[PDB]
Amino acid sequence: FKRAEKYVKEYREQEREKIRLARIAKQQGSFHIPAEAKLVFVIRIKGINK
């Protein structure tokens, strides 16, 4: 219970912390580049022929 309470917190802060930095850099006169994604889901949608 306590660990998932902690986990759902960081899901909220990480969204807000990425949002606020793009807002701050915009106002300060800069551009913020988010981190390239560290997780990829791959779905195979075509059969193995030829």
């Binding site: 850099a25 800069s30 551009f31 913020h32 988010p34 390239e36």
Partner: protein
């Protein structure tokens, strides 16, 4: 150059000497020396046939062979973590020894001051 029975060599096949040249399949390959003669040398080179592999013992002259430095990485890396492991155990601070495959880039900012962007057309006219 001195070549010992049982070392890794690279076969380049120079076109200056027409004697003792191999086929173009053994040009630009890497094998192991197993027999040394007065003027030629014998190299075992793996070859691919369909799904399996076959070892072919061919004769290459001295003028076409060259030593490989694939041992250069392995000997350098084996020493390199060994001295650090000696150092890290002496210091009592844990140290990463393996090599990590090039993580994604993190997040940062870019100031537009002194670097006002220039707008480009799809094609260049000037």
């Amino acid at each position: 150059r001195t070549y010992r029975v049982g070392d890794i060599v690279d076969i380049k096949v120079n076109g200056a000497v027409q004697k003792g040249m191999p086929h173009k399949f053994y040009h630009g390959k890497t094998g192991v020396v197993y027999n040394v003669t007065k003027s030629a040398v014998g190299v075992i080179v793996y070859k691919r046939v369909k799904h399996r592999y076959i070892e072919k013992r061919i004769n290459v002259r001295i003028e076409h062979v060259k030593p490989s430095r694939s041992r250069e990485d392995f000997l350098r890396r084996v020493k390199e973590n060994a001295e650090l492991k000696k150092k890290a155990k002496a210091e009592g601070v844990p140290v990463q020894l393996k090599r990590q495959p090039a993580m994604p880039r993190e997040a940062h900012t870019v100031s537009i001051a002194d670097n006002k962007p220039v707008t480009l057309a799809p094609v260049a006219y000037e």
